[model samples]
Target: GSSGSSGDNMEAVKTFNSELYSLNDYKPPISKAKMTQITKAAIKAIKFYKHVVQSVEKFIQKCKPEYKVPGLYVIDSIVRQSRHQFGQEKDVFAPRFSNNIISTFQNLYRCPGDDKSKIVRVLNLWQKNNVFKSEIIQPLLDMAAGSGPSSG
Candidate 1:
């Protein structure tokens, strides 16, 4: 019985990965119904098993460009959902997820040479909405805008 919850956590990871894989940048915008369901699944999984953060991190690294945007959206969903928490947990997630979210943004920026409008847009929303602290979001904004020093 002790092992049961571990398997449950792993299963949650699978659910999120499967759902995110279904997102398609080529198709028409993902429907609100579908998006909501994935968002629900994401929150459920992350709330119970924080390890899903790392699972999602790996998924983003390997997923196609088509899936990357949606993947980030799902991650944002969890962050936004966490805002309802009070006290210590209220502002815990952005800092907990800071590195994973930031590096994923960098990956999305450096790969495929896609337009950065969307990336910059997400960063702006995060800043204005307090999804992340100003110190973190501003440097990322600069990098996405090519105003920061080059990485390589």
Candidate 2:
């Protein structure tokens, strides 16, 4: 028999799709309406990422440099939460108010298709790297085939 665990093989697609659905926390496997929530959240994530990414780009660009050496990222804080350095025990640490930004992003593609942003491009990319596994987009397609998710 044939037994390859990875690559363009059909079994790999099925395995990946199964794992994707398994990540959802919906109990009772989620009703149709619950999927609607996932769909809406999924849509909302796009603009959210773009907005956050823009802010992050500008924010990091402004990290001041101490010259000759690389950028100097510094955060000064006392040993304790109390600002009193003369009377209280200096045994606590807390991040004080700093105009810093933190962010994270995930490439969640129920179906990414052959799409790549012309705004950016990568060299030596694999075909599978940009394609979404069949099942990622299958749920939407199946729903649309029936009449799409109901509005409420």
Candidate 3:
């Protein structure tokens, strides 16, 4: 019998995918209310969620935004194999494409007067977070990102 490593791996992926699913499906559970319809906890959750999504997308493009798999901790851990790829110092991040990322964030930051703080918080969240610790074939993450990596 396998050491149940497969099960363990799937559990992690399940958690990861649920998180992504939540991020994608984020909606205020409560309707707008004068009594703080948007709680601090909810705001923080969405902040981290968006940060996670963008980090993977901006994981660095060899051409514009990334060269490595623009991927991060995700469903594969639970669904396929617990495979993921991480950063390498030699690689570069997408400088040009990142401008769009920045612009989009800037727009969000400008929506409300206090939004500047939220913007700072989200940006910090991306850097301050542990990033990803999951290990897997680089190609898995590469494929997960957009294009598939050579399974060779």
Highest lDDT model number: 1
**Which pairs of residues collide in candidate 2?**
79-92, 80-92
Local distance difference test scores for all models: 0.63, 0.24, 0.28
Q: State the lDDT at 115 in candidate 2.
A: 23
Give TM-scores for every candidate, taking all chains together and pairing residue i with residue i. Answer: 0.72, 0.18, 0.26
List the candidate numbers ranked by TM-score, top first. 1, 3, 2
- Model 2: per-residue lDDT, tens digit, 38-109? 323322232232332232223223322211001101101111112233213321211111112111011111
Tell me the lDDT of candidate 2: 0.24
The segments of candidate 2 whose C-alpha lies over 4 angstroms from its true place after superposition are 1-26, 50-152
Name the 10 consecutive residues with the lowest summed lDDT in model 1: 84-93
- Tell me how many clashing residue pairs each candidate has: 0, 2, 12
Tens-place lDDT digits, model 3, residues 1-152: 65544455334333433343333333322122311211222222332333433433432221121111102212112111111121322112222123354333323333333323333433333333322222312222232223432255
Angstrom error of the Cα, residue 66, model 1: value is: 3.6
1 against 2, candidate with superior TM-score: 1
Where does candidate 3 have its weakest 10-residue lDDT segment?
75-84
lDDT of 3 at 105: 35
Q: Is candidate 1 or candidate 2 better by lDDT?
A: 1
